[PDB]
Design a protein around this ligand. Structure first.
Ligand code: PF9
Ligand code: MG
Ligand code: ZN
Length: 314
């Protein structure tokens, strides 16, 4: 370092600030994109460059070549968080800014392209070790492993205190990406907001808000321009349908979402998901963090494209 400011070509330098940015198909640029976002979100001082780079490269190595839950997904979720942090400058601690971009990069480490359900039904060792949020507790465990490799402690300068706090922000952040947890979390946030009890000085309230951000970042493929959204849906179903196939081999009819024989109903299934999860998610997030409203608007836009698909208008 430390007069060594990372820069992106003009188009990326401008579009990276927007919620709907797509990080693109040039895999070798994704590390530079992430370091750019850390340096602007957090500072050039937050992390030792050599250690950050070594961390990023080990994190990348520990994502598998699955259709959806891959390194690209990791970096895409990190960028959505960067857009939130950058649109809500003053709402967030120095520790939170440090923790949340790492949490996002690490949140699906060593994902195998299967649901927590399938691990339970297959009777995978991870399901014995972690009874709920099975893959999510795994992802946090892989983060700690990588943080513990020689020359990988990016938090080296934090006090004992701060270090324990940052790893606790990351742990909760990662556990929150378990969508089964999202539903209750958002209902409580919605009630706290409407009864006016929401208080960002209550750590237990901050936790829930960061949980909702995590869901929002995780789901952020539904907040992209339609051609990105449509092509990403292909990837997520490529995994679900393989898991369906694996269910059939255990002697279990999978749910329709995972049955490649019920492909035809993708459009209607996306509609449910926009109505039941995505729209409520970005709606409650906008109420709590007004500047995140572009994510709701882009989500609404994509619901209407799926309505178009159904009507045979595409
Ligand atoms: C956490 N997470 C990410 C995503 C996601 C979504 C879109 N693009 C990228 C990522 C999802 C998700 C949720 C539902 C879904 O399909 C819903 C559904 C329900 C009944 C069906 C019946 C027949 C056919 C299809 C059917 N699809 C597909 C993906 N979960
Ligand atoms: Mg996950
Ligand atoms: Zn994810």
């Amino acid at each position: 370092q430390g007069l060594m400011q990372f820069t992106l070509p003009v188009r990326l330098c401008k579009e990276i600030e927007l919620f709907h940015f797509d990080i693109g198909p040039f895999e070798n640029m994704w590390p530079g994109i992430f370091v750019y976002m850390v340096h602007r979100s957090c500072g050039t001082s937050c992390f030792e460059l050599e250690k950050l780079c070594r961390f990023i490269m080990s994190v990348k190595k520990n994502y598998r070549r699955v259709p959806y839950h891959n390194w690209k997904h990791a970096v895409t979720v990190a960028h959505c968080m960067y857009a939130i942090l950058q649109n809500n400058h003053t709402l967030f601690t120095d520790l939170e800014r440090k923790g949340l971009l790492i949490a996002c990069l690490c949140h699906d480490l060593d994902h195998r392209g299967f649901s927590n359900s399938y691990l339970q039904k297959f009777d995978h060792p991870l399901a014995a070790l972690y009874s709920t949020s099975t893959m999510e507790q795994h992802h946090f465990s892989q983060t700690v492993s990588i943080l513990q490799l020689e020359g990988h402690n990016i938090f080296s300068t934090l006090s004992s205190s701060e270090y324990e706090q940052v790893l606790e922000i990351i742990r909760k952040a990662i556990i929150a990406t378990d969508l089964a947890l999202y539903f209750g979390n958002r209902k409580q946030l919605e009630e706290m907001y409407q009864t006016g009890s929401l208080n960002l000085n209550n750590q237990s309230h901050r936790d829930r808000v960061i949980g909702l951000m995590m869901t929002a970042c995780d789901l952020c493929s539904v907040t992209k321009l339609w051609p990105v959204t449509k092509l990403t849906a292909n990837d997520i179903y490529a995994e679900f349908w393989a898991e369906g196939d694996e269910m059939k081999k255990l002697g279990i009819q999978p749910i329709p979402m995972m049955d490649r024989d019920k492909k035809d109903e993708v459009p209607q299934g996306q509609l449910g998901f926009y109505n039941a999860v995505a729209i409520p998610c970005y709606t409650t997030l906008t109420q709590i963090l007004p500047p995140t409203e572009p994510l709701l608007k882009a989500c609404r836009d994509n619901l209407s494209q799926w309505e178009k698909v159904i009507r045979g208008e595409e």
